[PDB]
Design a protein around this nucleic acid. Structure first.
Ligand code: MG
Ligand code: MG
Ligand code: MG
Ligand code: MG
Ligand code: MG
Ligand code: MG
Ligand code: MG
Ligand code: MG
Ligand code: MG
Ligand code: MG
Ligand code: MG
Ligand code: MG
Ligand code: MG
Ligand code: MG
Ligand code: MG
Ligand code: MG
Ligand code: MG
Ligand code: MG
Ligand code: MG
Ligand code: MG
Ligand code: MG
Ligand code: MG
Ligand code: MG
Ligand code: MG
Ligand code: MG
Ligand code: MG
Ligand code: MG
Ligand code: MG
Ligand code: MG
Ligand code: MG
Ligand code: MG
Ligand code: MG
Ligand code: MG
Ligand code: MG
Ligand code: MG
Ligand code: MG
Ligand code: MG
Ligand code: MG
Ligand code: MG
Ligand code: MG
Lengths: 67, 60, 144, 260, 185
RNA sequence: CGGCACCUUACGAGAAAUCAAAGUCUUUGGGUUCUGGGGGGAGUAUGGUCGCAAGGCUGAAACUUAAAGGAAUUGACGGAA
RNA sequence: GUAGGAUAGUGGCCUACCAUGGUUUCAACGGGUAACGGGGAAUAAGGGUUCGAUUCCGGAGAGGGAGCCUGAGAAACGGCUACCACAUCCAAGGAAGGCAGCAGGCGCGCAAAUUACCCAAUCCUAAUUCAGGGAGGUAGUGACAAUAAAUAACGAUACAGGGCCCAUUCGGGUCUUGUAAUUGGAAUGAGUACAAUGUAAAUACCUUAACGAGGAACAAUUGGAGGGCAAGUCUGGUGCCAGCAGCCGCGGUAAUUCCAGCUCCAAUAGCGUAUAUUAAAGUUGUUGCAGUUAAAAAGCUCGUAGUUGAACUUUGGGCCCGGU
């Protein structure tokens, strides 16, 4: 079997320079649990429709839909 | 060029052909072994040396 | 001097002379007039689906003596009426009146083949289930 | 259309970068900089592909943002910075200096120089002109404006730039009998001496160059870079010295070197 | 939008499909060298056509032309190296006179039978494709491997895959297990 | 010398009949113009142009078809000898 | 042409005043294009013929036109404005739109795949190592095309004649290709999988533990068997019918051609059909056709463009250097 190998000078210098997927492979990093690609982009495009924080918008929508 | 001839005889000979079933035979070998079989029947033992070669001789 | 001009500066006369005499070929004349698109029912194409209008039985040409069992097919993409030969034993029992057939050409780039007068296409599929496969036993024709 | 282009397709890259046809649809488009796009070598192509110091472009970025590489004494953290001809690349870790000179096949070679030679570079004079407030300036082949040059410096001369204070230490005229580094065309990378320069007023002055093996070749003056006198170059030449052995003599070298 | 992958067709169907002389001449080759198709003869004829035209246009050059002396020597060296051409007759007039059986002789399926080791070309075929005979230490299961005359001395059974010294196979292991349980414990 | 031709031969040419050109052509190039591209449809339709008109010049296509044709041989037939 | 205006700038680009020019049988102008141009592609004696929407370069366009804003860069359309076509929501007041991006639907048709996973690679953008990328990659569908090449291999036993000392007359360790839906033990991957590798994560490959071939049913097909053109005058059926047949032709009672069965042939994980094109086609002919009669010398002459056009002008000698 033929491959490639890296031996870093320290574990900290390995965690600095090594890809996160391959740290997850070796157990040096926990896998980040995000949403999937589609829900991330859908959330972004939903949040594009709000100007500002949306506190005023939420209060107005709540008050007006209360009546 | 008459176009309205009788169409009622269509499928006559295939319909009235007596259906005989395929017989059950051992499979021929496939691929390289079939070329081995052809080489044996054509260039090793030639029992049909009638002039040059007869490949499918009917019973005379 | 064997006809044609030969001189080094006589390339225009040779080129235009070949361009003029090039039209007497069948294929160049047909391809540059574009008669496959103007005429010749399948508009430059190989196959065409149509709808059967009526089953015909064509008298075969002399000296042959048979009924040729064709169909009259109106093409979907043109509306042109053609006659298409249903090309095996039986197989006219397989088509219908008023269903959809796929037609191909018939071997001779136009030029009605054999003893069939005026038929230059043939039925490859009926209802999309392929007359050869229907004829052997391989497929069953759909009811709709 | 419609604006400047920002992508370089792989197969539209310069051929001397030696990028593989597969493994991606795009090539690293060099940034704007001292050297033209098709006559430069980006730092990602130098580090990842030539030196093999990085496996990815992500690692080339990780190398450069630690301010390791420096081109001509300045750091140049861009991934696709156009390091072209004569450029001195110092990697302070690994303690080595490279000079981007062509090999004789027309490709930028990995050529390690010393720290003394890394303290200067050479520059072909592109124009000598008078700037504002009547101050003479000279423009080299890598975009350097150098004020108050020697008045004997003309176009097609070669100046020696000191890379720390970017001044002219000395210069080499364009005369018959001086070394040439051919920097363009199918004779690219070849080194020889000028036989003579053929004038052609109106366009494209030609130079007849003869190398050490007495093989003369004609090259346009855009591609001629003077590097020193007859012999004794001002730079260190790469391995091969710009000789252009034919392919029969090349396979003779290979069979005479691999048989031991 | 990557570079399109280059691909080539490595055989050529003959111009006349039904010639008794050619069909007998091809069945003799397919029964002598143990071939599967006639495509395995058309591939070799395609290689011969390419080699022979690459020599035929070099021979139109002057002698001691640089391209002739480079490419003809390379073509001769490659054919001599694979053993199609012998150690004498190193000439472009001698690579024109090559035949189809000179290339069929150098296959791994031909060479495994020729080096003892197989007792038939068809047994050589089924030994090669069943992960026996290795060419170096490398198991080769391609019958058209076309040995390059330095690997002739190292054609042998694999270090795995028995007849070369390994676990005794599948049907022998199962048949020995049934023989071991049928006697008792 | 120039002309209308003719007779013999086949060097040669040609599918042959025959040809001193229809030769000097697979050993293919002296110069040049025009024309033909299987048979019909068709010298038709239409357009242009010329004519007082008749028509002339130019001039298709769809479609159809496995031959049409050329030279010669043997026979048969002739209200041919 | 002169001058101005305009432009980022040249310029009839536009304006004002003058002049009457400019292109064309060396094909202008107009018409068609089922024309985006090129690198290139198919076929390859040579010359050619045909294709190039399509992975790279350049152009053009975002439903059709037009106009503009911002900006270095746009006459931008995942920017705006108007008109035209189309079309969505509505509480009828209004409001919103542009898949020739990716995936997908309808329609059209002979004709073309997933509303998948991810930025790990290639690169690009941004204040930027960090974010984003339907660009791109990965997988799914996929017989477009291309590469390699399973479907069996080896004996023993009954029988071959190719044979030995004149086997006289078969023996002998005969020599074993075929032949026993006999007979035996080996061989292995298609498949199924522990695992590891793979990978961004998986799938596949590659590597492998245990399984996994005897009718090795773990069963190769597609076209054919008159000629062209490889291969039957075998058998049953039909009887100018049915049908075959590219062409010639076959069929009217023994059909080598139809429908079948048996056998045989050709290519083979491929083979057949249709359409186009190339070679064949020296049947487009420059190479390289033909014109007496096969198609074809203008009825004849003059003549412009075009094509073509007699011979002649420093030859010869001698000496020296000088690369293979
Ligand atoms: Mg663009
Ligand atoms: Mg860049
Ligand atoms: Mg194994
Ligand atoms: Mg006289
Ligand atoms: Mg005609
Ligand atoms: Mg006329
Ligand atoms: Mg008229
Ligand atoms: Mg006549
Ligand atoms: Mg006649
Ligand atoms: Mg002005
Ligand atoms: Mg002006
Ligand atoms: Mg004006
Ligand atoms: Mg178009
Ligand atoms: Mg040819
Ligand atoms: Mg094009
Ligand atoms: Mg194109
Ligand atoms: Mg189009
Ligand atoms: Mg483009
Ligand atoms: Mg645009
Ligand atoms: Mg649209
Ligand atoms: Mg629009
Ligand atoms: Mg901006
Ligand atoms: Mg727009
Ligand atoms: Mg859009
Ligand atoms: Mg856009
Ligand atoms: Mg789409
Ligand atoms: Mg398709
Ligand atoms: Mg800042
Ligand atoms: Mg990111
Ligand atoms: Mg994409
Ligand atoms: Mg293939
Ligand atoms: Mg199978
Ligand atoms: Mg039959
Ligand atoms: Mg035959
Ligand atoms: Mg019969
Ligand atoms: Mg002809
Ligand atoms: Mg005639
Ligand atoms: Mg006359
Ligand atoms: Mg004249
Ligand atoms: Mg002259």
């Amino acid at each position: 079997s033929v491959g490639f190998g890296l031996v870093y000078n320290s574990v900290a210098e390995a965690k600095k320079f090594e890809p996160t997927y391959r740290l997850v492979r070796y157990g040096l990093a926990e896998k980040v649990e995000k949403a999937s690609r589609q829900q991330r982009k859908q959330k972004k495009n939903r949040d594009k429709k709000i100007f500002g924080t949306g506190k005023r918008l939420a209060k107005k929508v709540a008050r007006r839909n209360a009546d | 060029a008459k176009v309205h001839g009788s169409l009622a005889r269509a499928g006559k000979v295939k319909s009235q052909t007596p259906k005989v079933e395929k017989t059950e035979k051992p499979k021929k070998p496939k691929g390289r072994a079939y070329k081995r079989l052809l080489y044996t029947r054509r260039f090793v033992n030639v029992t049909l040396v009638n002039g040059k070669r007869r490949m499918n001789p009917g019973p005379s | 001097g064997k006809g044609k001009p030969r001189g080094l500066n006589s390339a225009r006369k040779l080129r235009v002379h070949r361009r003029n005499n090039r039209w007497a070929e069948n294929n160049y004349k047909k391809r540059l007039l574009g008669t496959a698109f103007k005429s010749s029912p399948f508009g430059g194409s190989s196959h065409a689906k149509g709808i059967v209008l009526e089953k015909l039985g064509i008298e075969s040409k002399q000296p042959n003596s048979a009924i040729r069992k064709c169909v009259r097919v109106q093409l979907i993409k043109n509306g042109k009426k053609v006659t298409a030969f249903v090309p095996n034993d039986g197989c006219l029992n397989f088509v219908d009146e008023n269903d959809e057939v796929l037609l191909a050409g018939f071997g001779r780039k136009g030029k009605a083949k054999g003893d069939i007068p005026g038929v230059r296409f043939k039925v490859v599929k009926v209802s999309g289930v392929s007359l050869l496969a229907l004829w052997k036993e391989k497929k069953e024709k759909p009811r709709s | 259309a419609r604006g400047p282009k920002k992508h370089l397709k792989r197969l539209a890259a310069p051929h001397h970068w030696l990028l593989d046809k597969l493994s991606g649809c795009y090539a690293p488009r060099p940034s704007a900089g001292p050297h033209k796009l098709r006559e430069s070598l980006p730092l990602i192509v130098f580090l990842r592909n030539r030196l093999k110091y990085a496996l990815n472009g992500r690692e080339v970025k990780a190398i450069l943002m630690q301010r390791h590489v420096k081109v001509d004494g300045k750091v140049r953290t861009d991934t696709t910075y156009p390091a072209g001809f004569m450029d001195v690349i110092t990697l302070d870790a690994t303690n080595e200096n490279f000079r981007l000179v062509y090999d004789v096949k027309g490709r930028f070679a990995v050529h390690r120089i010393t720290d003394e030679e890394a303290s200067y570079k050479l520059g072909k004079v592109k124009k000598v002109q008078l700037g504002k407030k009547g101050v003479p300036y000279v423009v080299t082949h890598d975009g350097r404006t150098i004020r108050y040059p020697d008045p004997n410096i003309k176009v097609n001369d070669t100046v020696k730039i000191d890379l720390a204070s970017g001044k002219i230490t000395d210069f080499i005229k364009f005369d018959a009998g001086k070394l040439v580094y051919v920097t363009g065309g199918r004779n690219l990378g070849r080194i020889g001496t000028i036989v003579h320069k053929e004038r052609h007023d109106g366009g494209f002055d030609l130079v007849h160059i003869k190398d050490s093996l007495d093989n003369t070749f004609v090259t346009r003056l855009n591609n001629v870079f003077v590097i020193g006198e007859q012999g004794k170059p001002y730079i260190s030449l790469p391995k091969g010295k710009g000789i252009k052995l034919s392919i029969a003599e090349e396979r003779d070298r290979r069979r005479a070197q691999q048989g031991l | 939008p990557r570079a399109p992958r280059t691909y080539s067709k490595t055989y050529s169907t003959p111009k006349r499909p039904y010639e008794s002389s050619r069909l007998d001449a091809e069945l003799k080759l397919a029964g002598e060298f143990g071939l599967k198709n006639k495509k395995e003869i058309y591939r070799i004829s395609f290689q011969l056509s390419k080699i022979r035209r690459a020599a035929r246009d070099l021979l139109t050059r002057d002698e001691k032309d640089p391209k002739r002396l480079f490419e003809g020597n390379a073509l001769i060296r490659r054919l001599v190296r694979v053993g199609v051409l012998s150690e004498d007759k190193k000439k472009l007039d001698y690579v024109l006179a090559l035949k189809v059986e000179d290339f069929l002789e150098r296959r791994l399926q031909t060479q495994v039978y020729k080096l003892g080791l197989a007792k038939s070309v068809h047994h050589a075929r089924v030994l090669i494709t069943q992960r026996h005979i290795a060419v170096g230490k490398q198991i080769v299961n391609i019958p058209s491997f076309m040995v390059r005359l330095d690997s002739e001395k190292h054609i042998d059974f694999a270090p795995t895959s028995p007849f070369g010294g390994a676990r005794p196979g599948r049907v022998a292991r199962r048949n020995a297990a049934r023989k071991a349980e049928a006697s008792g414990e």
